């Protein structure tokens, strides 16, 4: 209960036996700062324009797409994750994992 304990090096060398068999497949870091949180500054405004916009895998479901995919998404504006619109499976689909973010992301 509240350990604040650094795991021992005996675990570290056993985790160094991991690349003997297992290598890291991939990750998905959510906080892509597409919003203006990492673009503006007080007394330093940016005179924006419209439409200038100064490896593509779905953030919600784990279905890999192509380089320039085709399927459409609803814009989860709060964090930029691709809340993709039309799920591939509907006749056999989970009815809450899709419906929890049927509106927006958390």
């Amino acid at each position: 209960e509240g350990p604040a304990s650094e795991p021992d090096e005996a675990l570290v060398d056993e985790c160094c036996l991991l690349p003997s068999q297992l290598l890291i497949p991939s990750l998905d870091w959510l906080p892509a700062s597409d919003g203006l949180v990492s673009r503006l500054q007080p007394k330093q405004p940016l005179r924006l324009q419209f439409g200038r916009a100064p490896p593509k895998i779905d953030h919600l479901r784990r279905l890999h797409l192509g380089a320039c995919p085709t399927e459409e998404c609803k814009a989860c504006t709060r964090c930029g994750c691709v809340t993709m619109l039309k799920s591939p499976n509907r006749t056999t689909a989970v009815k809450q994992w899709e419906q929890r973010w049927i509106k927006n992301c958390l």
Binding site: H64, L65, G66, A67, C68, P69, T70
Partner: protein
């Protein structure tokens, strides 16, 4: 032998091209999709590229076996000192250059005696091959050498030199008395044939064409090489008009630097 050692090159490249092309077949189908605006410009291109790469693999496989059909079939320390002499032959070709004969000559204006045995040594150098032709050197008149040449069963040619340079050349057939009644070589006469008199003009134009101010040996060598094409007379049709006879005349005129029988009208 090197015919198999160079015919193996196409196959040893083709198998690696098969590996690369099947890798392309794998990853392009594995690349997913690149729409590039319209879908009809992509999904109709999907079957196009899927036919393209698979058919490239197929044609590579196919051209593999026609190459496979035609083909057939101190320990290492002193080996290193062997092939360097063989690459010295390439080193001889390193300093050759393609500039060759062509130069950038301007006007030659500012601001001799040689023995006839040298002429004999000149004529002995090229008579040693082409056994179908013969050379008979003679000087019954002065030190100038005029030569009798027989060409198989076809031509008898008198070739007069003077001052080690060219004087004259007259060609006749095979069944005429090229000598006179006295037995000396004839000097001033005519070939008494329309084709022969027509091609003597071509010979006169050719002798004024090969122009070396210092080196007449290559002039007369190119002249006799040009004459060597004339043992194919009455046997090869013309290269542009198809038929032999242009107004009853078979092709004779060999072009400069491109030896093939033509006419004056046929150029």
């Amino acid at each position: 032998v090197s015919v198999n050692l160079e015919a193996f090159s196409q196959a040893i490249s083709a198998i690696q091209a098969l590996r690369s092309s099947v890798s392309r077949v794998f990853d392009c189908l594995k690349d997913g999709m690149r729409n590039k605006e319209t879908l009809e410009g992509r999904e109709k291109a999907f079957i196009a590229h899927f036919q393209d790469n698979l058919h490239s693999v197929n044609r590579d496989l196919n051209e593999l076996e026609r190459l496979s059909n035609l083909v057939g079939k101190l320990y290492s320390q002193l080996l290193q000192a062997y092939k360097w002499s063989n690459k010295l032959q390439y080193h001889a070709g390193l300093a050759s250059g393609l500039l060759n004969q062509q130069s950038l000559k301007r006007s030659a204006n500012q601001m001799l005696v040689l023995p006839p045995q040298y002429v004999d040594d000149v004529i002995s150098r090229i008579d040693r091959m082409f056994p179908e032709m013969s050379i008979h050197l003679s000087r019954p008149n002065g030190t100038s050498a005029m030569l009798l040449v027989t060409l198989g069963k076809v031509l008898k040619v008198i070739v007069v030199m003077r001052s080690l340079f060219i004087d004259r050349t007259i060609v006749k057939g095979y069944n005429e008395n090229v000598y006179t009644e006295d037995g000396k070589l004839d000097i001033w006469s005519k070939s008494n044939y329309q084709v022969f008199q027509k091609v003597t003009d071509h010979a006169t134009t050719a002798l004024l064409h090969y122009q070396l101010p210092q080196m007449p040996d290559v002039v007369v060598r190119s002249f006799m090489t040009w004459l060597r094409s004339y043992i194919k007379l009455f046997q090869a049709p013309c290269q542009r008009c198809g038929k032999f006879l242009q107004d009853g005349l078979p092709p004779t005129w060999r072009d400069f630097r491109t030896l093939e029988a033509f006419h004056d009208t046929c150029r």
